[PDB]
Design an enzyme around this catalytic site. Sequence first.
Site, PDB file in Angstrom:
ATOM      1  CD  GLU A  29      -2.791   1.057   2.486  1.00  0.00           C
ATOM      2  OE1 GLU A  29      -2.805  -0.007   3.141  1.00  0.00           O
ATOM      3  OE2 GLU A  29      -3.657   1.949   2.613  1.00  0.00           O
ATOM      4  CE1 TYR A 372      -8.765  37.727  12.037  1.00  0.00           C
ATOM      5  CE2 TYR A 372      -9.410  37.396   9.758  1.00  0.00           C
ATOM      6  CZ  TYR A 372      -8.512  37.869  10.689  1.00  0.00           C
ATOM      7  OH  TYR A 372      -7.358  38.486  10.264  1.00  0.00           O
TER       8      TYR A 372
END
EC number: 5.6.2.2
Lengths: 728, 729
Positions: A29, A372
Site C-alpha cells: 500500500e 476569526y
Amino acid sequence: SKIKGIPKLDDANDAGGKHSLECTLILTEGDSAKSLAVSGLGVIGRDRYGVFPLRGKILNVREASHKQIMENAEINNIIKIVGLQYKKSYDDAESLKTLRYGKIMIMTDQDQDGSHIKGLLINFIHHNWPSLLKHGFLEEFITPIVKASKNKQELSFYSIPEFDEWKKHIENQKAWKIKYYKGLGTSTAKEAKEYFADMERHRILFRYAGPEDDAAITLAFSKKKIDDRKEWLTNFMEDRRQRRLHGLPEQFLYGTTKHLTYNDFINKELILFSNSDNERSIPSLVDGFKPGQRKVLFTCFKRNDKREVKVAQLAGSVAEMSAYHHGEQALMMTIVNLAQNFVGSNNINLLQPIGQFGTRLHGGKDAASPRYIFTMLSTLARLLFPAVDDNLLKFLYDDNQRVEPEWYIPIIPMVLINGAEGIGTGWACKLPNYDAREIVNNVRRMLDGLDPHPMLPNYKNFKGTIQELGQNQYAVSGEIFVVDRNTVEITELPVRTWTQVYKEQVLEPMLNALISDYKEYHTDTTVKFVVKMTEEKLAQAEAAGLHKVFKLQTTLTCNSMVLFDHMGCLKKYETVQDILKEFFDLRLSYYGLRKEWLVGMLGAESTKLNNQARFILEKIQGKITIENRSKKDLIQMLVQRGYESDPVKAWKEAQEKASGPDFNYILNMSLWSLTKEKVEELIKQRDAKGREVNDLKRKSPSDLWKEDLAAFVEELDKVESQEREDGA
Amino acid sequence: SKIKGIPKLDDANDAGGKHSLECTLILTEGDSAKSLAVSGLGVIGRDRYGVFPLRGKILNVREASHKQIMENAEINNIIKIVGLQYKKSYDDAESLKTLRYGKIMIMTDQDQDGSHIKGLLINFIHHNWPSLLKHGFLEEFITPIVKASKNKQELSFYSIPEFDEWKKHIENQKAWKIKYYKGLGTSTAKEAKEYFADMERHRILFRYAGPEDDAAITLAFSKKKIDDRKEWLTNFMEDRRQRRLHGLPEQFLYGTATKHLTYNDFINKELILFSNSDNERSIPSLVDGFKPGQRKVLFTCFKRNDKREVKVAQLAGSVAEMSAYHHGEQALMMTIVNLAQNFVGSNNINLLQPIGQFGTRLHGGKDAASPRYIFTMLSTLARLLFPAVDDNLLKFLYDDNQRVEPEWYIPIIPMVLINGAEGIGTGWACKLPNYDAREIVNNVRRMLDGLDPHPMLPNYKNFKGTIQELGQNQYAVSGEIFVVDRNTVEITELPVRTWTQVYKEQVLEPMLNPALISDYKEYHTDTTVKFVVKMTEEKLAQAEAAGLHKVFKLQTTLTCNSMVLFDHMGCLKKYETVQDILKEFFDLRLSYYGLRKEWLVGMLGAESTKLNNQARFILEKIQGKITIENRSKKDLIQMLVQRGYESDPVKAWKEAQEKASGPDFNYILNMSLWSLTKEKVEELIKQRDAKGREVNDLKRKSPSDLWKEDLAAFVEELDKVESQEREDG
C-alpha cells in the site's frame, strides 16, 4: 526473466527464471509500506522476494469497460511483473511454472481502506483467473496487532483476544507501553527487520474453500449485485446486534489462523469497509449525531470552556482529543454547522455562533473564517446532555486514547429537533425539524401514561405554513400578499429556500416575462420582495395560485427516516412517534441507571466527608496528633481509630470491577482546613451530602427526568427570548 | 438606471439617478463580509448604499494583457455597476455625474490579505482613472480593532495605541473579556448594526497626496520594479530594527489613526506588511534556525512536555490549538515530519523522534506513512539545546489574546548551522548546508577562551562520501564508487540530497536505454546504497578515464553564496561566512547567559526565602510554638504578620519583575496536612538547605561557566543517543 520499463519495482533476483515458483511478489500500500518491506528484506532477502508499490486502489475490473481495463497501468504492470496472461487460465497447477512469481503477498494496513485494497487485488485475480485462488497463489503480510512491556521485556500479540487474556492475569496488569500496530507505518525499520526474520509468523494464506468463496468475492464487487449487498449489510448489523446483546465477541478485530478463507475475508473484514459509509453518513436515533458531530461535541464537554474560543482553536482540540480523521475542512464545517441558528438550520444550536457563521441569505455558505469566528457551548447543551449521565455511557477508544461515546443520551430526542440528513450505501436519511416544547410535553405526557399528541414539522422562526398532504408528506409554503392593483409582497420563503438562490433562480428569470420590476428589503434574517406587475399579469397569477407562480411551495417527506438504533443497527422508522417511543423507553431506562449510580456515588461521597470532617474535628480537639509522626505510624493510627479508606475510590473500583489503606483524601487537605471558617464550611458540606442522599432516595427515575425537563424549558425560555430582543 | 444581469449585486435604490453622487458602492471581501454589511444596512440603508461581493482578488491590470483585462468578469462587473468607462478620464470633477455611484467603500479584513485586496482595488482605479483618486473616489470601512469590558460595560477602541493608553489608567486595569476585531467575521450582525448606525466613525477616506502616491502605487504593483521592491522591503526592515532598538512603537497596527489616509501611507505602512510576508515565513532566523511554523511546533512540544509518545495527528491538533498555526493541516504535518526525519541529507540533529515510518533516503522523505499511524516525541537533546530556564528570557508573541511561540528561541549552539536552512523569499533565497554538531561545540568553546575559531566545512551525519572545498564559498560533494572487476563497478554512496529511487530513474535507467550499461542489480537497505552495474569491457575503459564519478552523475556542488537569514532583530541580512553566523550568534547567546544568571539569582533567592518561611512554619507547628487549629482566618494572618512571616516571595519577585490585596500566606497554608509528618518535615528541610546552596553556588559561576555546563550536558547525551542510533541499526 529481466523486467524492463517498470522503475518502481524491486524485482527479485531469482524471479522470472528457474526457481520462479519459489519467488514471492509483495504488493504494498504505497511507498511508505514499500520502504518498510525494503527495510525488512535487507540484502539477503532480495533473492526470493520482490516489492512493487500500488498507487492508490486497484481498478474494480468487475464493473469497468474493456477500454478502461486494457489501459489501466497498475494492472498491466502487475501482469507483466508477475507473468500473468489473459489467454491462460492456470487450471493445471503445473502452469504456475510459467509465471515469474509463485505467490503474491498483499501488504496493507490492517484497516478498512487496506481491507479494500486487499479485496480489489483478490477481485482482480478472481475475475480473470479464478483457478489461481485454489492453488494458494495469494497471501497477505500481517504484523502483530498490539505490543506491551512487562519487566522491561516487550511481548507482542497477534490478536486482540490474545492480548486480552494476558492482561487479565494479575502478573500482567502493570503492563506498560501498550501500543497498537494496526497501521504499517507505526512499525520502525528495526521492528520491520524483526518481522521479516520470522516471516512465517506474519505470513497468512488465502485458502479457497469451495463455491461459497466465488459468490462472496462476486457479492462484494459485482455491479449487478446491488440489492444483495443491501441484504448483505442488513444481516451484518442484525448479527452484530445479537452478538452485543448476548455478550458475545465480534467476528473480526483485525488480528490473525495461518489460513484465511476468501469467504471469511469478504464477510468479516471487507464488510467493515462496505458498511463504513453507512456508519459515518447516518445519525444515531439516540442523540441525533453522526460520529463526527459527536466527536466535536465530546471535545466541547471535556474542555468545558467558560469563555468563548476561536473555531480554528477548537478544531485543534477536536483533532487532539477525539482522533477526528476526516480532515480539517470537514471538521470546520462540522463545528460551523453545529452552531448555525438561521431559519432552516438547527432549532436548538448546541454551539453558539459568535460571529459570521452563515445566514439564510446563502444557506450558511457565507460563513466567515474559522480564524476569526468564536464559539462555545450553548447554555442549553448540558441541560440537554446532563454531565452526570456521562457516567453511564460507553466511551470508545482510538487505539489507546479514550474518545467520544458510541452515543450520548439527551433528555429529549435531539434527532427530531435539529433534524437528520445523510446518504449511505443503499440507505438514505431525511428527517425534518420538530418543535422542542412539543416534544417535552409529549415526553411529559408519556410519563403520565397519557397519549402522545401527533407531531408535525416545525422550524424555529419560520413564518410560513407546514400542512399535511398525506402519506408522511408535508407541504411547506412561504408568504405572498397582494397589496395593490400592481404589487405583491413576499415576506417569507419556504424552509431551506435561500434568499440569493431564490433571487437568482426564481425572481430574476421571471423578469426576462411575468413581472416588470422588483425591489429588495431583506435583513440578514428576514425576507421582503416588493414585486410589480401589470394588472393583467397579476390577475393571471392570482388565478393560477400566487404561491405556485412564484415557486414558494416545497414538500417535506417522512418516507426515508432511517437511523441507527441504540445497538448500531440500521432501521427504518415509519412515524416520528415510533422514533419518540424507542427513544423514550431507552431514556427512561437510563434515568434508572442514573439513580442507581447516584445512590452509590452519593453514599460514597457521604462517607468520604464523614471521615474527613471527623479527622478535622479530632485534630482541632487534640484527640489525634499528626506532628512528628512517621507515615507508617500515622496510617496505623487511622486504622485503629477506625477511619475508612477512600470510599469514593473504593466505590469507583467496585463499579469498574463489575497497596494498603488510602487516607490521602484526608491528609491531602490543606493546613487551611484546620481554621475556623473552613471547619464550619466542611461540616456544612458533610451535612448537605447527608441530605442529598435522603432527598434522592425519595425520588423516582421519572421524577429525575421531570426535574431536568423543567430546568431545560426555563433556560430555553430565557435564551430564546434573549435572542428575539437582540434582533431589533 | 437599473442594473441588469448582475445577480450578486444589492444595487442601491437611488443609484443611477438624481442622487448618484450621494450613493456609495461597498465592495466586500467575499460573501461573508457582504452578509455583515447587509445586516448593518437594514432596510433604510438600501437607498444610498449598494453592496457587491468580490470573488478573490482583482487582477493586477498593471501587468496584464489586453485580452485578460477585457475578459476578466469581476473587473467588467465593477465597471458596469459603477458606470465607469475606459474612454473617459474623469479629469473634470463635473464628470462624476456620469457615474452611478460617487464613492466606492472597500470593506475587507484588517489583515494582510485584506490589505492586498484593497491595494489591488486602488491599483485598478489608479491605472485607468488617476483623476478619480484625486477627487476622493475611494474610502474604506474599518471596524474597531479591540473591545474590552469594565464593570459590565463594553468599550470599543479604534487603534492599539488608544487601547494601550486606556489600559494604563488604574481605574481601568480590570479589563475583562478582551477581544480583537481585526477580522470582519468576528463581529455579529448585532455589532454590524451598531457600526452602520454610526457610519462616519468607521469611514476612512483615501486622499491623493501628490506624485509621492503615484510612485508608491506603481512601486507596489509594477512588473518592471523587481529590484526597487527589494530596496523598499530592505528599508522597511532597517526602520523596524531601528524603531525597536530605540523603543518606539510599531509603524502600523491595523487601526485608524486619522480620518484621512494617503495612498502613500497605505502602500508603505500597510500593504508593505503583506509584501514582506513571504519573506517572514520562508526564511529562518539566525538565532534558532527556525521558520515561524517550526517555532510553533517546537513551542507546542515544549508546553505539552510529553513524557510518552504521541500520534502525529494528535500533536498536529495540539499545535493548531496552542500556537495558532494558520498554514493548514497539510503544511503542519509536513512541518512535524520534517522536524523528526533523521536520514542522510536531513537533520543532523532531529529535535523530534521519528517513532514510525517518517520517511527514508529512498525517496527523500516523501515515503512517510500517515499522521494517524506515526508517533513522535521530543528528542532527549531538545531541552539540552533549548534549555527550559532560558524560556524566562524570550519575547513571546500573541495571536490576538492567546500567547503563542516566541519571536525566537536561543539555543546553546547555532542550530541554523546544524540542520541547515532552506527557503525561497521575495527577492531573497536561502540555501545552507549542515555542519557538524561536535565541531561547532568545540568552536564555541574556543571563542569562550578568547581563541580563533577553526574553519568549518559542511558535514552530513552518516554521509560516507567526500566534501571538499572547491574555492569561493563553493563545496564539492562526491559519492563513492569503486571498480571491482573488468566488467562490473559498484556504487556504495550517493551525494547528499541524491535519493536512491530518484538516482535509479533519472541516471541509471536511461543509461540502460547513447547507452553505457547492459544491466544492474540493487542491494540497498533503507539507509545504505549499493548498485552493481555490468558493462562491456570497453565501456568501463572510457568511463574510468573520463571520470567514474563524473560519468555516473555522482557529483553535486554545495554553495554558501546565498546565506540569507533574519538577524536577531527581525531584519534580513546576507552572511558571507559560517564564521560570521557563529560570531553574531555567539555574542547574542553569551549576552543571554548573563541574562540567565541575573534571572536565576533573583528567582533562586526568592525561592530560597520562600522555603525558609515554609520550613519555619512547619518547624514551629511541630514544636508547638504555633497553633492554627480552630482559629480565625484574620486571627491567623495577623499572627503570621506579627511573627514576621513574609508574603509569598516568589509572587512578590515575579510581580516586581513584570513591573519594570494584602499579605499572601497561601504558599504556607495550602501545604497538605502530610507536611507535618516526619518524612515530609525532613524532605522540606533538605529542600530548603539545598536551595540555599544553589544560590551560593550560582554566585560563584560566570555566564561562561553556565554555558560550558550546558555544553557538557549536551555532548554527553549526544554521544549516548548516537551510539544507541548505531546499535539499533
